[PDB]
Design an enzyme around this catalytic site. Sequence first.
Site, PDB file in Angstrom:
ATOM      1  N   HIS B  41     -70.271  69.125 -13.623  1.00 48.07           N
ATOM      2  CA  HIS B  41     -69.194  70.073 -13.514  1.00 48.07           C
ATOM      3  C   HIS B  41     -68.160  70.327 -14.430  1.00 48.07           C
ATOM      4  O   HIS B  41     -67.549  71.198 -14.358  1.00 48.07           O
ATOM      5  CB  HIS B  41     -68.363  69.697 -12.176  1.00 48.07           C
ATOM      6  CG  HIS B  41     -67.496  68.338 -12.545  1.00 48.07           C
ATOM      7  ND1 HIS B  41     -67.393  67.262 -12.071  1.00 48.07           N
ATOM      8  CD2 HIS B  41     -66.142  68.489 -13.144  1.00 48.07           C
ATOM      9  CE1 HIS B  41     -66.381  66.500 -12.650  1.00 48.07           C
ATOM     10  NE2 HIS B  41     -65.543  67.300 -13.090  1.00 48.07           N
ATOM     11  N   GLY B 143     -58.254  65.591 -15.865  1.00 52.78           N
ATOM     12  CA  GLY B 143     -58.659  65.154 -17.184  1.00 52.78           C
ATOM     13  C   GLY B 143     -59.371  63.956 -17.412  1.00 52.78           C
ATOM     14  O   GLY B 143     -59.813  63.760 -18.429  1.00 52.78           O
ATOM     15  N   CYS B 145     -62.021  62.803 -15.685  1.00 53.53           N
ATOM     16  CA  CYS B 145     -63.421  62.850 -15.576  1.00 53.53           C
ATOM     17  C   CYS B 145     -64.180  62.652 -16.736  1.00 53.53           C
ATOM     18  O   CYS B 145     -63.845  62.814 -17.892  1.00 53.53           O
ATOM     19  CB  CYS B 145     -63.905  64.234 -15.060  1.00 53.53           C
ATOM     20  SG  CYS B 145     -63.477  64.344 -13.235  1.00 53.53           S
TER      21      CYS B 145
HETATM   22  C1  LIG Z   1     -62.298  65.947 -13.306  1.00 53.53           C
HETATM   23  O1  LIG Z   1     -63.236  66.899 -13.143  1.00 53.53           O
HETATM   24  C2  LIG Z   1     -61.246  66.132 -14.535  1.00 53.53           C
HETATM   25  O2  LIG Z   1     -60.569  65.178 -14.884  1.00 53.53           O
HETATM   26  N1  LIG Z   1     -61.517  67.170 -15.191  1.00 53.53           N
HETATM   27  C3  LIG Z   1     -60.704  67.861 -16.205  1.00 53.53           C
HETATM   28  C4  LIG Z   1     -60.523  69.318 -16.057  1.00 53.53           C
HETATM   29  C5  LIG Z   1     -61.274  65.811 -11.932  1.00 53.53           C
HETATM   30  C6  LIG Z   1     -60.728  64.258 -11.773  1.00 53.53           C
HETATM   31  C7  LIG Z   1     -59.796  64.288 -10.699  1.00 53.53           C
HETATM   32  C8  LIG Z   1     -58.501  65.068 -10.678  1.00 53.53           C
HETATM   33  C9  LIG Z   1     -57.439  64.539  -9.857  1.00 53.53           C
HETATM   34  N2  LIG Z   1     -58.135  63.090  -9.986  1.00 53.53           N
HETATM   35  C10 LIG Z   1     -59.263  62.793 -10.313  1.00 53.53           C
HETATM   36  O3  LIG Z   1     -60.003  61.950 -10.050  1.00 53.53           O
HETATM   37  N3  LIG Z   1     -62.193  65.970 -10.862  1.00 53.53           N
HETATM   38  C11 LIG Z   1     -62.365  67.056 -10.271  1.00 53.53           C
HETATM   39  O4  LIG Z   1     -61.664  67.883 -10.517  1.00 53.53           O
HETATM   40  C12 LIG Z   1     -63.339  67.046  -9.156  1.00 53.53           C
HETATM   41  C13 LIG Z   1     -64.457  68.271  -9.650  1.00 53.53           C
HETATM   42  C14 LIG Z   1     -64.212  69.281  -8.715  1.00 53.53           C
HETATM   43  C15 LIG Z   1     -62.999  69.008  -7.547  1.00 53.53           C
HETATM   44  N4  LIG Z   1     -62.725  67.433  -7.712  1.00 53.53           N
HETATM   45  C16 LIG Z   1     -61.851  66.724  -7.222  1.00 53.53           C
HETATM   46  O5  LIG Z   1     -61.768  65.541  -7.925  1.00 53.53           O
HETATM   47  C17 LIG Z   1     -61.114  67.255  -6.332  1.00 53.53           C
HETATM   48  N5  LIG Z   1     -61.417  66.742  -4.964  1.00 53.53           N
HETATM   49  C18 LIG Z   1     -62.168  66.985  -4.253  1.00 53.53           C
HETATM   50  O6  LIG Z   1     -62.209  68.427  -3.960  1.00 53.53           O
HETATM   51  N6  LIG Z   1     -62.838  66.257  -3.228  1.00 53.53           N
HETATM   52  C19 LIG Z   1     -63.514  66.514  -2.048  1.00 53.53           C
HETATM   53  C20 LIG Z   1     -62.708  67.301  -0.983  1.00 53.53           C
HETATM   54  C21 LIG Z   1     -64.637  67.583  -2.435  1.00 53.53           C
HETATM   55  C22 LIG Z   1     -64.099  65.356  -1.496  1.00 53.53           C
HETATM   56  C23 LIG Z   1     -59.582  67.653  -6.403  1.00 53.53           C
HETATM   57  C24 LIG Z   1     -58.894  67.985  -5.211  1.00 53.53           C
HETATM   58  C25 LIG Z   1     -58.976  65.979  -6.624  1.00 53.53           C
HETATM   59  C26 LIG Z   1     -59.308  68.423  -7.735  1.00 53.53           C
HETATM   60  C27 LIG Z   1     -65.417  68.609  -8.341  1.00 53.53           C
HETATM   61  C28 LIG Z   1     -65.554  67.685  -7.362  1.00 53.53           C
HETATM   62  C29 LIG Z   1     -66.747  69.095  -8.932  1.00 53.53           C
END
Ligand SMILES: *[C@](O)(C(=O)NCC)[C@H](C[C@@H]1CCNC1=O)NC(=O)[C@@H]1[C@@H]2[C@H](CN1C(=O)[C@@H](NC(=O)NC(C)(C)C)C(C)(C)C)C2(C)C
Lengths: 306, 306
Positions: B41, B143, B145
């Site tokens: 992603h 951040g 991920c």
């Molecule tokens: C990760 O992508 C990151 O660090 N990216 C930097 C730009 C991030 C880590 C998340 C953020 C808060 N705590 C974490 O562990 N992961 C995501 O943003 C991930 C990416 C999007 C949406 N993501 C989420 O983790 C979201 N959660 C959900 O949407 N969960 C359900 C409802 C689908 C089960 C949130 C809301 C936390 C941003 C994708 C899943 C592709």
Amino acid sequence: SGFRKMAFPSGKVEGCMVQVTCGTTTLNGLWLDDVVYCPRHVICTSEDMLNPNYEDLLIRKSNHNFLVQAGNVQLRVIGHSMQNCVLKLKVDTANPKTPKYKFVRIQPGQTFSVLACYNGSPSGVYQCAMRPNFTIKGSFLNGSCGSVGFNIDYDCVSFCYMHHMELPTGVHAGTDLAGNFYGPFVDRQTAQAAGTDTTITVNVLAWLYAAVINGDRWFLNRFTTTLNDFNLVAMKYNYEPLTQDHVDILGPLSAQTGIAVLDMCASLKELLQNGMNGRTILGSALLEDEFTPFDVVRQCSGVTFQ
Amino acid sequence: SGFRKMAFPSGKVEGCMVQVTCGTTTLNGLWLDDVVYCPRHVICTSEDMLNPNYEDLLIRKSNHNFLVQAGNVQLRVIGHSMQNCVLKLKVDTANPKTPKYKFVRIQPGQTFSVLACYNGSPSGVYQCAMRPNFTIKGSFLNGSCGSVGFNIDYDCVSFCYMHHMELPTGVHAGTDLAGNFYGPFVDRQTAQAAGTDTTITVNVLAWLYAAVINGDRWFLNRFTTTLNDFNLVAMKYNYEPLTQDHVDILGPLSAQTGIAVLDMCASLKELLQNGMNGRTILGSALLEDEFTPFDVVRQCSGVTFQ
Ligand SMILES: *[C@](O)(C(=O)NCC)[C@H](C[C@@H]1CCNC1=O)NC(=O)[C@@H]1[C@@H]2[C@H](CN1C(=O)[C@@H](NC(=O)NC(C)(C)C)C(C)(C)C)C2(C)C
Ligand SMILES: *[C@](O)(C(=O)NCC)[C@H](C[C@@H]1CCNC1=O)NC(=O)[C@@H]1[C@@H]2[C@H](CN1C(=O)[C@@H](NC(=O)NC(C)(C)C)C(C)(C)C)C2(C)C
């Protein structure tokens, strides 16, 4: 989100660990530039430990009595001196992995990461606090002497602890990296006891703020308290006094959550008086006191190190 | 003595962390030899995440769309492929700090160390377990991920986890390093829920053995139980079933302490039925289930890594 006992990344310290062998004694040393630091009781024997005179003991040593292994590479000692309870071995090679570093003597209540080591090889890393009674509740087996505790601040390793000994209660005592013991302890096998420990009140409050930042709010209440009235309850539960300085340190956390420090004190008061009644906070059924206000902010905001 | 949640020394993994930037998305990657692994992603945008088609998305990318920072050194991508939910970026430079390593997909109940990272820089290290419901109770902010979980086995880093996402309950989901999610989760913003979690019974028993090794014995009793009768009580308290295989794994610990596994099960039964009654075990007022039998043996016997 989430909240974990987090240690600093240990790589900068891993590259400094060496094995120091003198006689029948092997333990860990810390190699920074061309000096290896290690506990001075490496010059003791099985019958020296009762009341040794390290000054005699060391004057009888030669440099070639000291085996320092840095991995599969032997370092030769070209000089030695004792500084309080640490021995300093001058070697002919500067550690190329020497990080930017400082030696710091921490206050009780402060936390640090411990890189547990045996025979110069790292075994694990965990977070400790220096207890009010100047012990640490570590995880240390025979051979772990010379393992160090540290914090990392941007790119700088602040060494604050080197392990020496275990107390009959299963807790641990050691020195700063200049060899001064934390607490009243001495590196001789004589009757010593830790002294009554107490809970680190400002840290418990930090951790309650961590809980709020992370979505636990069940323990909050509408009450407030005075510092005086709070401290009267704290003393009764063997908590350290909370000072106005502690209140000031909790300012940033109070500001980010919107919960006045003394309001959080009122919550802690009710938790002390009523217990948790089968509920947990941040996955704990005890009031946790080994996170500083800085630890909470670092982990809840994501500070890194290069 | 002492018993701590201990992470593996993180240095071998620290030397592999890099920043991967594509478009407006920055996250961590894992640089091993001439490949950087990161969550797929990273090719999404703020409006892609609802139901993206990563195959279209990636076919529209060019190598020069991928910014990889390894410290103050930019790596250029010379190829890219997607493997399940991880993206693999071929770079023109092999990581000279590449440790000996393996990719492993772990079973639930297994533990591992997480090196939390932001912008390619390590923030902290902590111990996690893969929960029975295939989430992990981590500490992860935006951040993080691409941060990885791992074990170290002598000199070999076994990577088992890369972080992708957070679930509405504050727990975390991710993949193995081949990009296969643990559990039923998918990397798309659609309704997903963890599934009911349960306590890792064999790990609780390991930790009770750790307590005995370390001098807590108050919870022992003279009773025994059958596996069948134990499992009947475990199911009632939402504990995972204990299998004969689990019993066999607990053999070494049972042999070192002299407490038959089913005798320890009788102790856990009474702890489940009566609670701890204001007493602690290894500094915990809860039954701890994130230490495996191997974790206990490693820490109570002092295994290292070069
Ligand atoms: C990760 O992508 C990151 O660090 N990216 C930097 C730009 C991030 C880590 C998340 C953020 C808060 N705590 C974490 O562990 N992961 C995501 O943003 C991930 C990416 C999007 C949406 N993501 C989420 O983790 C979201 N959660 C959900 O949407 N969960 C359900 C409802 C689908 C089960 C949130 C809301 C936390 C941003 C994708 C899943 C592709
Ligand atoms: C340390 O010297 C080591 O690892 N050396 C390798 C040969 C060792 C670490 C200890 C061992 C168990 N847990 C630990 O943290 N430290 C010592 O052996 C230390 C040295 C001797 C005696 N030491 C002890 O820790 C002893 N404890 C005491 O004697 N404590 C009191 C009664 C004096 C307070 C024990 C009994 C644990 C060996 C000296 C203090 C110089």
